[PDB]
Structures are given as structure tokens and as C-alpha cells.
RNA sequence: AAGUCGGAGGUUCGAAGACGAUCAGAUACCGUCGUAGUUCCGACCAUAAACGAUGCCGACUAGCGAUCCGGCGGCGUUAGACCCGCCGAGCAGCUUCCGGGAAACCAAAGUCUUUGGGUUCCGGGGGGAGUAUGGUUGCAAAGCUGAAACUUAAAGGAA
RNA sequence: GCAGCCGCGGUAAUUCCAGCUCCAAUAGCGUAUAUUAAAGUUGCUGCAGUUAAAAAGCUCGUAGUUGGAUCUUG
């Protein structure tokens, strides 16, 4: 049975796409089939932002961030629980969670 | 598996051919 | 719309349709007399000219070829019948 | 763990929809009413039914309950809902009309009316919301 | 789809001609095979000499001993294994006696829980096996 | 249906849709038979007269029931022709 | 009504313009396009009030054609039209359903709220989609106050009007009740109706 | 490519009748179409159609009466005789009481009943009922 | 009989004279007593198939019986109802009630000459249910029902004396077989023939005519 | 893609292989290396779940919001960009009782017992078997064409 | 041992060996094989090829097949 209309990838009217490597296991995954996640986090987390700010040499220095674009294969994205299996009707929801 | 069965078949064709060329 | 009148369509919808899909196909193009400000002779040029037309005497350039209707120069008239 | 069973709540609603005029805000008064108008094989069940009747009676006095439907109560609350202002909210001194709406009335017999006030049509078609 | 043309008779006739061979029933009865491999050679019955009495195990889930006889055909020398149909009729079949065997009921197919026996005994010693089973004939 | 001699042999003559001429089946429960009352040409009051329209469930389900009744009212003079 | 006595008067236009019944939103239906006049610069479509009145009278003619007034069922699930259908029922003698429409009142005969009306007037085709789809299993025509984006899956008489604003939905039930009584002969159509249109309007809890 | 024009003409009519349309626009017109629509019109299956001249193949706007169940073509145009005409009446027509099979005979385009009354066979164009 | 619907009250009070009045207005029949009031005299029922369907539960198999009942007066009226209940007697009883509420008018025509009462189907109709399709074809007066035993019981109870039948699909499925045949019979009186081209003269609905009696 | 032959180059990776772990055993998964290969040039090979598991051409049968290209005319903003529509072309999406289907689902997988627009290839229970043999192609690996005896009452799809 | 098929038989077998009884055709009735209908499971009528067996990886291309409208109507 065809489980998904897009076959699990965002490829339409296109023959081949260049692959990438999953961050957990370096395996060849198509760029559209990859479960991407652009994570923007601070270099200093909230548990340590107090000590770093009070020990700074500047009056007002904002801590930088880590702009990392993570890529995941289907298998590792589910073991890492970044995507869950949804109901047969809930799968059709293409909106990101709030 | 259908692919390893296909591999066992080609390994068998290659043996039947060499056994047939010996008596050629 | 089960009883839409196909024999008598409104002129606002026939101009909307493609020039081939109309009830009777008709071009969306036309001709026009271009009067340059330098000379007095008027030249009948095509709307979708696609060539570089010139006035009699090589006074100036009238329009320029484009992907659609030709782009006229400054100070010219058009829309003849 | 003070949730009433459907046996307590259903029997309490039927008692109200049939004997609303006999019940009140006193448990011990309703306890004796339910004992007579209803044959309850237990006394604990009667106190639970009468105790929930007293609870529902405190709700009827403030408004309609989504379970209790009394004819004499619904007709009066609808009759007492007849409220109208001293002047209607539609007959206004001036009426703002878009120039496109003004042209629609122009095609009808109501071309020029003193009650109409044409507003300046705002420039810029920014009605759609940005995508993404 | 199919060709619906006024001059497509040869195209349709040749297509059906070559697609009928994909039908295993048509191909079986239109080639040299399955007729020479058939021990009867196209006949409904055949006579043979009983080589030995053999008991064939009934296939699962059934469990019994099918009383059969290894028969050598007289017409072509082929050795087949018939089946003594009725109850206890194996005792009527002597040794090295001429018997008339026929198909088991299906065209070259094994009938019932018997693994491969596709024949059955009809007569024995020029006497029908049904007459010996009912006692109306002897020997 | 006739019997080639004048006799009528049908159990009943089924209705036909006033918009698509489709026969309204006996189990077409989505079909309707709406009656639109007529008014007096002076007072505009009900004069016990009405126009009858039957629309099968197919024309309703496809959404063309409202436009069909509006057009059927034009041919009967119920709605105006400046519509 | 194509007569002169049934024409829209000037007093009716001032009510429609004040209530905003000509403003029907930015979305448009392909079967409600014939009722739309023109789209403004801010995307809002203008409903043709002339075609709103003709469909309003056509609905009133279908209501007065029902002999028993209790055979007409007025339904409004949304709170904006709950008071408007309760006043319409008292004026016309209809059976109102203003609360939550229980699925089964038309098909399930063993239910307590089981009814068998002959006409089904609806406030919103989307908010009241359940009685519309249930009026398909029984041969019941339906009238609805369809907006510009309202579907016509079963609506037999669509009244194009702004069924979103409280002053607009209350007026469309006041205009229809006024016309049903005028065709029956209760009111003479010569003098203005005694009932004020604000009686049918919805009142917010912060104001009532 | 459009190898048959009568096919697309009757297909548009059959689909417009299924949709409850009042009029259908046949984009390519021909002599066979106009005479085919005439056979359907003489028996009351379609209304009056208006041929539209555009100095090309031409278009036709047919008025649909709703009385037509299905109209279709028979491709290819087989050669039909009088002895073989009853065979097509059992395969194409829905009953022996109504429905017609249009034939193009040397005497012109007509249905199977008129072709039998004129006692002439020919080629089959289509059917309607 | 205590009528619950307005349609049942008019039938109980002798306001509706025949069953063709309900079919004329496509009104739903929700009370089986309405059917027994008109056709209850010459109405015959037949148990086509007792079909045990099983729901996989931990208690081995939960066997529930589904019955197929064909109801018809053998002239112009036939019905088909299914009912799946725990008991066989209850499944048959409930299916008979549903077979009455589904009774449709059967239109019968002639083959060639129109002499006497109608004997066969008016035209070629095809009913479908699942993969099964059943085509009904007219036949001469003395032909009979040339069909399988399953549609023959429906065609004889529908008053169709003669019919040529062709069936494609899994006709071993008696459920889809009987329902496709019943669908083919129900397609009659809805096929627009030239003899039904006349403009319909609209009458008053039973709810409209007897609106005063229903008050 | 892998593979094959001849040159150039071989950073990374890595069949094979070695060794270190894990295990009852691993000749595996995991780790440290590492040959061929991966790269380039020329000549072969012509096979993929080469998939949209859905031939190509043409007509017709709903709606809506987007999007890519071109064209067209309209407030306004900006120095072509944006905004609002229309037309043709295309990749898609969604809502629908258009209809179809065994159903999943499909605006096509519709217009189909109311069966015929044109045309090519191709399927006939499951195995045996893409095997045997013959021919042909290739340096080879293998490609293409392609059976039968015999065996079997199910195999399978969707839910 | 029965059983074309699904199955029956492991100590109360409605299926085998028999008695009784009943049923079917009837001076005929079984069996084996070929063959026709059943088979719309060979397809012109008239099937199929998204997932059940299936549309060549893709395109070009000869033969083959099939090809717009239009010419004497009234
Ligand atoms: Zn991974």
C-alpha cells in the first residue's frame, strides 16, 4: 500500500537529487527526503548565562548563537524522537508544531 | 532473499558453463 | 451555472478569453499611426511589431521590438482602426 | 471523590422538570419532597438525589441549566428578552458608503440620497496577509 | 489500448495467435510435449502387467496407506503406478496379471491425498474390478 | 407507457426534474418539490396560488439547485427580469 | 416579486447599508458569483442588494406557501442568529432550533427532538451544515442566508447577505419576518412595522 | 491528434448531459456532425443547434433538452447490411421500443428505421437513445 | 400500530390511498406497518442466505449472523434488506423489516409488440454493488428468467416474468449479487424513455394536501 | 551505480583483506587500517525499487488558494522590486457525493454491460524459471531472445 | 477406506464397511479421455497492465495502423 502521496520525500517533477549525510550516522540520504532541522541555540545555555554575563569585560555584550542546520535520516530522526509516527489522518498535517 | 537467490543462480550458471566447456 | 448562454457571451468575458478559445477567434493586436515629434509623416506600424521600424527619412526610431507589444519612443500616437 | 452517578443526576433532573414548583434551596425540604414524589429504595440515594436537586436549584435561579428544560421557565425567559433601545441602531444620521457601493445604488433607483456619505477609497491593495 | 481500425484484421489475428500460447491449457494441447510424456500416449485406457503391489502414504493432514500397484504398460513399456480403488480389492489383483488402467479422474493430475498416483485399476485378468468387488464374478 | 390500445400499464408516472428533466426516483430523498406562492398584482398578498418546482437530488448536491429555482422563477414572472 | 408593491423601498436600503449586509468578505464562491456586484479595493466583495431583495421575497413566497406555520423550521447554531430565529418563530409561528442541533432529529424517529418540517430556513450554511445534510435524507427544501463564501451543497434558496455581523444577520431575519407577514396579510405593508429591527439583533454578554 | 471529429462531438454532448447542462459547445464542426445532430433533433433528443461560422472548421452550440441518455460513435465505421442490421440493434440499442442507430447510406444519413424503410444499407456512424 | 411519522399517520387514517403516492414524491418510508397496510396481503418473503460473520476477539471467534431477505408481492414491488444480529431469528426478523422499508416500484415493459400486461423489463438496466454488475435485458413473453438462482428470486418477486440476465464479477458473493440485482431493478422508473417525455403535472404532496389533518 | 580494458592521478572514503571488540560462535553489525574502486581521459558494458511501481497523442467532465516562465492592464509604494487581476505553459497542493474502483485511493486511476477517438508494448493460478537448450551481443562479468518434463489448491491484492 | 473439490475416520463416523430408508435418471445408468458451452479465465462483439500477473529506462524511426475542415444546397 502506498503509505504517502509524496513517497516520503519532497521531490516533484525531478529525476535525481544530490544526497547528504545524516548527523547521527553518516549515511547517504536525499536532500528532500532528509528530515532537516535548523536549530538556533545560544553558545551559553541558561544554566550558565548568569556567570558569563557578570564576568564579561563589556557593559552590554549579547552572547552569540550557534546557527547549525541539522540533517537526519528517517531512521535516526525517529530514534532521536524529532519526528513521531502520527495517525493515518494526522500524517496529512503539514504544519510545524507550535 | 530474491537478490541472494539471484546471486546463487549466477554462481550456478558459471559452474554449469565451466563444467560444460571441460567436455567440449 | 447549468444554463450559461454560450451563443451570446458578454463582451467582458470574450475579451478575457484567449484569442483562440473565443467564440470566433480574433487577434488581440492592432495597427497604429505613429507621429514622431521631429517630422510630420505618420507611419502605420503593428502593435506587436517585433522589428525596428523607422520613419521615412531616417529621422528617429519609432518603436523597439519586445516579447509582446512593441515599446514606442517618446511622443508618439497610436490606436488606429 | 464527590462525583454523582448518572442515577443521581438523571433522577434529579426529572424531579425538577416535573416538580419545580415544590423544590427550593433547602436540602431538608427537598429531601422530604423527593421522598414522596419519588419511590427511592434507599435513603443514601435519596440524600444524594435531594442534595443534587438543591445544587441545581441554585443554578436555575441564576440561569438555564443545559439539562433541565421547563416549559414555563423557557417561555418567560424568552418573553422577558424583548429589549429594544429608544432609537434603532440602523437609522443613523449619516452613513459611510464606499464609492463602489455608491455605484451599485446608482444602478438602482437610489442614486442620490442625503443619508449617503462617500468615503475616500484607500489606495494600496494590502488586504491579503503575507505568506509564510 | 487495442487497435480498432478498419484494416487491422492481420494485426488482431496475429496478436491473438501469439497470445494463445500464453494460455497453459491451449499450449499443452497444441505442442508435441504432454502427449509423448503421457504414458497412455493420448488414450483413455491402457493395459499393463502388475510389477508389484506398493503402498503409498496419504498426504497430510490425512494418514493412511493407499493400496497401489506398480504397472508396466504393454503398449510402450512405460512403468506407471495405478491405484486399486475399492476397499480390499488389492487382494483380487494377482501377481504379473494383465490389468486395464485408466486415468484417476483429472487430466494428468494427482487426485486426492495420494501424492503422485494419477491412474487407477479398472479391470484385472480380463475381469472388471467392480464385478469382483460385488461378488458377481470370480477369479 | 401505453399498451398499444390506449391502456396505461404503468403503476405511476414519476416526476421529472424541473431543471434537468431527470426522472426523480422513488428513493431519491435528496430531491425536493418546493412550492413558491403567488401574490396579488396590487396588494402583494397570498392569493392561494403557487408555482411548483421539483429538483432532483443530483442537481441539489452539485450546488445548482438555487440557480435553477431562480431561473425557473424568471420564466414564471415570480422574480423580476432586472435580476 | 416583479411588481411595484414588492419593490425595495428607500427605508429598506438605509437598513441594509447601516447593517452592512452588502459587505460579504474577501472570499467568493463560484455559485454565489451571480449575486456579487463588484470587489472593492480592500478585497471585500459587494453583494448586489437588488438581487438580495429578489431572493428575499422568493424565500418569503416559499414560507407563506406552507399552510401550517409549524412545518417551517428555522435553525441557527451560531449565537449571532439565535435571538433572530426565536423572534422569527414567535412572529411567523415556526418551530425554532437555536441551540445545538442534535444529529438525528430528521432521520432518527425514536429521538425526543424528532421533527418532520416542510421547509428549513438556515442562518449560516457552514455553521448549520448538519441540518442541511440531514435535510437531504428527507425531502425537505431549505433556505439559507448564504454569504459570498457560503457553499450551496443543498441550499435551494440562497439569500445573498452578510450572515456574519450581528446587526446584519438580525436584519435579514427582520426583513424576512416582515415580508412573510405582509404576504399573509397580517401587516398591511402601508405603515411601518411596529417591531424594531434591533429586537432580532444579538447582544454581547458585556452589554446585555 | 483528432482523428475523428464525430467522436469528440458526441463525447462533449454525452458529458454535458451527465452534468445537467442546458447548452454544449461543439468546437469542431463538419457535415457529418450537422446531419447527425439533425437525426437526433428530428426525434426530439436535442434542441435547436446554431452553427457558428468562423472561416474555419466551425463551431456548434447545441441546446440540450435533457431527453438524451447517451450518444456515442462506433469506430471504425463498419459496413452494415440489411440482414446484419438487426444484430447491431441488440448490441447497441437499449430496447426494441426506442433508440436509433445512425447509418450513412447512399441515400443520405439516417437512422436504422429509415434505412430499413428505404431498404438500403451502408456504414454505421453512431447511436443515441 | 401507533404512527410516529406524519407519513404513517396519513396511511393509518386512510388519507393515502395507495403506495404509489409515496413513490411519486420520493418520501422515505420509516415504518414497516406502512408497507403491511398496502401490500401486507400478498407480500411474500424469502430467506436468501444466512451469513455468519465473525469478529476476532479473545473468545476465539464472536459469531454474528447476517441474513438476506427478499420481499415482494410478485407484481411491481420488490424489496431487499439485510440485518446482522447475534441470533438467527432476530437477524431474519430485522431483515424483513428492512426489506419492507426498501421496497421500490418495479417498472415493467414489453419486448417488441405491446399486447397484454407488461412481462419483461422496459429497457437494458445495469445495477452495481461492489464488483458485481447485473444487466437486465428484455425477453419474449414465454422466455422466463434466464438468470442465476439468486437474481431469479428477486426478479420473480419483482413481477418480471421474463428477463435475460448477464452478470460479471464475484457473483459467488450473494450479498453483492442480490444488491446489484436489486440495484438494477431500482434503476427502472428512473430511466428516461420517450414514453415519459411529457411534462409532469405537479400535484400536492401528502404533507401539503393533508396539512390540516396533521394538526 | 557497480563492473571491464588501456593511460593519468590516487586527498577523502572504501568491496576484498588484516587486526582490534562483542558473542556460545561473527567469517557480521562497532573500531583502527587498507587493496580494487572512488577522480580524470579513451574504448566497452546497457542493467536499477531506471518508480509517479501509472505508454504516447487528442477531446471532454468541478471549484479554490499558491507557485515557475512569458505576455497583458490596473490603485499605490519604491530605485526593475512589490501590490491587484487576466491569458497561455508547466511542477505541485487542497476541498468536493463529478465519477470510478476490490478498496486503499484517483480532476484522473473520470467520461466503461448506457461497453468502439488513434496507436505501440505487454499480462493469463502459484512453482519449475528468467532455469534448460539454440541463436545473438561482450575482453569478461553478463545482456537479449527463451522452454519443457514435473509439482501444486492455493499464491496474492486491499481493507 | 471415502473423497472430481472442500474434506470424512483417532470409540456415540449424518461422509467410510453394511442393514433399513430415501433421492436422482430410467431400459438405461456409471467411469476414463478428448472436445464445446460455462470462459467477459484469449477479448471483433468483450477482458486486463498504480498496489492482485502486467506500460519497453528513455527518445528517434521504416513498414504497418490511423489521419482536421471544405466542393449542389433549398
Ligand atoms: Zn542516521
Curated annotation (Swiss-Prot), chain F:
<comment type="similarity">
    <text>Belongs to the eukaryotic ribosomal protein eS21 family.</text>
</comment>
<comment type="function">
    <text>Component of the small ribosomal subunit. The ribosome is a large ribonucleoprotein complex responsible for the synthesis of proteins in the cell.</text>
</comment>
<dbReference type="GO" id="GO:0000461">
    <property type="term" value="P:endonucleolytic cleavage to generate mature 3'-end of SSU-rRNA from (SSU-rRNA, 5.8S rRNA, LSU-rRNA)"/>
</dbReference>
<dbReference type="InterPro" id="IPR038579">
    <property type="entry name" value="Ribosomal_eS21_sf"/>
</dbReference>
<keyword id="KW-0687">Ribonucleoprotein</keyword>
<dbReference type="GO" id="GO:0000447">
    <property type="term" value="P:endonucleolytic cleavage in ITS1 to separate SSU-rRNA from 5.8S rRNA and LSU-rRNA from tricistronic rRNA transcript (SSU-rRNA, 5.8S rRNA, LSU-rRNA)"/>
</dbReference>
<comment type="subunit">
    <text>Component of the 40S small ribosomal subunit.</text>
</comment>
<protein>
    <recommendedName>
        <fullName>Small ribosomal subunit protein eS21</fullName>
    </recommendedName>
</protein>
<dbReference type="GO" id="GO:0022627">
    <property type="term" value="C:cytosolic small ribosomal subunit"/>
</dbReference>
<dbReference type="InterPro" id="IPR001931">
    <property type="entry name" value="Ribosomal_eS21"/>
</dbReference>
<dbReference type="GO" id="GO:0005791">
    <property type="term" value="C:rough endoplasmic reticulum"/>
</dbReference>
<dbReference type="GO" id="GO:0003735">
    <property type="term" value="F:structural constituent of ribosome"/>
</dbReference>
<dbReference type="InterPro" id="IPR018279">
    <property type="entry name" value="Ribosomal_eS21_CS"/>
</dbReference>
<keyword id="KW-0256">Endoplasmic reticulum</keyword>
<keyword id="KW-0963">Cytoplasm</keyword>
<dbReference type="Pfam" id="PF01249">
    <property type="entry name" value="Ribosomal_S21e"/>
</dbReference>
<keyword id="KW-0689">Ribosomal protein</keyword>
<dbReference type="GO" id="GO:0002181">
    <property type="term" value="P:cytoplasmic translation"/>
</dbReference>
